[PDB]
Amino acid sequence: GVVDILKGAAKDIAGHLASKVMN
Incomplete structure (x- = not known):
């Protein structure tokens, strides 16, 4: 799942x- 964290980190x-903005 480490792969999801690398690409997800940016998208995050x-x-x-x-x-x-919501705050």
């Missing part, structure tokens, strides 16, 4: 920004 950044 994009989804993270949305969080800040």
Whole structure:
């Protein structure tokens, strides 16, 4: 599943920004 973390880590950044906006 380590492969999911490498590509997911980046994609997570994009989804993270949305969080800040939601706050």
